[PDB]
Amino acid sequence: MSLLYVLLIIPIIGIFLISTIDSFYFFNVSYYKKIALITTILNLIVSLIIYILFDFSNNQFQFIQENLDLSFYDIYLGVDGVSIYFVLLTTIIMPIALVSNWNSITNNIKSYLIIMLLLETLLLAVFLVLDVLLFYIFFESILPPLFILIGLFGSSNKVRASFYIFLYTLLGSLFLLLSILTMSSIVGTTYFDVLLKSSFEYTTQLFLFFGIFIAFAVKTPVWGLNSWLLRAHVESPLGGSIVLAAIVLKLSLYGVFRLILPILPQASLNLTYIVYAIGAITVLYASFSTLRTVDVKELIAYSSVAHAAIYLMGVFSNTIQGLEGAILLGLAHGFVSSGLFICAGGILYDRTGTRLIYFFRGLTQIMPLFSLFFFILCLGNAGTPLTLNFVGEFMSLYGTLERLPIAGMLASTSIIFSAAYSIYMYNRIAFGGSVSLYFIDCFRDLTKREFFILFTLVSFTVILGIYPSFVLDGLHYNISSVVYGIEPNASYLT
């Protein structure tokens, strides 16, 4: 069997073991948690084995298994240098997601672990499948377990929040389905190798673009459309919020390198000015309203909207630099947003039971270790050099500017306004007076669990910010096949 199926089967084996141990024993919930965490370690172990054996400049799909037994819907699993790092991020994030929420679930612990083990399978799949109809199948199988992850383990406004993400993500995904169905009917299949050969007529590509973009604007999400995220990324449990922002948000970032860039190039080129206008607006309106947010977890959720706009504008630049910067900023947001939900929804909400920023002040005086990590995370969210977030923004903004110079200049306002929301939140909670008077008793500082998941996540952000070539070497050759263009003395050689 292929080694890419081993990534899928392990979480499946782990769900089986959680449901069949109580039959060998009133077993403790501690042993439920250990099995799920070990089984996400193994996926990470395997995924690094896949990465050692990867070939950084091969234009054929790798780790493929020859099926030669065709059906109507067959799983085809290939790994490519444009998808490898999305897989690695998934497998590094899911253990922290489990450890972060280790004592906070308290009830329905089996069901909680079985959903996350299910989620890791489906999100691993969406990066590994070699069809665009297969891509859609897994891109939307994550929807039922997320409706239940929010309504069982979510906060007060959990019911409306779970309806919002499900219904918005269902609606937006059904316009992508109509366009995928058109592509398949014209071409006969949705297997990548046969689609990338095929070139659609301009008018068809103009109508496939309207349909793949409706979906991804719903799933970025852009400003006019993000009302599900400000509910779902907040009412959800801590572990739900980590997966939703780090991994689920990137399903459409990686889905533009497959669905738009190679098969609808003329449409992408001629409509970019519409994308850039939308992207510029969500860099401003989201930045303006991230200043006035009184919910700490909601402030982090709103930050993701402004970040996602920068990478969306990068993936539409037709430049090798904005394309790699978009993947780097997708990865960068993955580690940093994870840490700030760990700070907001998993530490202050553990100790105070509230998310209102009015009750917090001067937390440096009694939690110095929280303050140190909270400040480093806050500076990466502000796009400060030495973090992977700065590199992703620099390259994303450069390509946005080289393609359409006016929108990149309005996108670069982020540099100013991301810094203004990030420092203002940090100053209000850690600094900004003395330990607040609403704290009747003292609050303990970080536990050894809270320290080491923040430390792990922060370490990824810095070392990748110093040596981004750890991720750039795989991207260069594979990214070099989604650029559309020619130069006069370099093309059509004889």
Binding site: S19, T20, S23, F24
Partner: protein, 80 residues
């Protein structure tokens, strides 16, 4: 995937779900014979689906050749 493998497992999955819906214990020793019976029925149904597959393949093959005569022979008569 292998049909005999999928269907054998499908029968083992059907036993696990039935005990879960009944809330009866999975794996009590004096009832473990159910898993072999459910798996054997899953093996047998699948040997029947392999015979179904074999015949359908012949039929779809013939038809794709017939549509390739109708399109051909019509083009032959349009050459006049």
């Amino acid at each position: 995937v292998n049909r005999i493998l999928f269907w054998t497992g499908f029968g083992l999955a059907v036993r696990f779900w039935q005990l879960g819906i009944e809330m009866r214990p999975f794996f009590n020793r004096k009832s473990l014979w159910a898993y072999p019976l459910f798996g054997g029925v899953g093996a047998s149904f699948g040997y029947w689906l392999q015979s179904i597959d074999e015949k359908q393949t012949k039929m779809l093959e013939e038809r794709k050749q017939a549509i390739l005569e109708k399109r051909a022979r019509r083009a032959q008569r349009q050459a006049e």
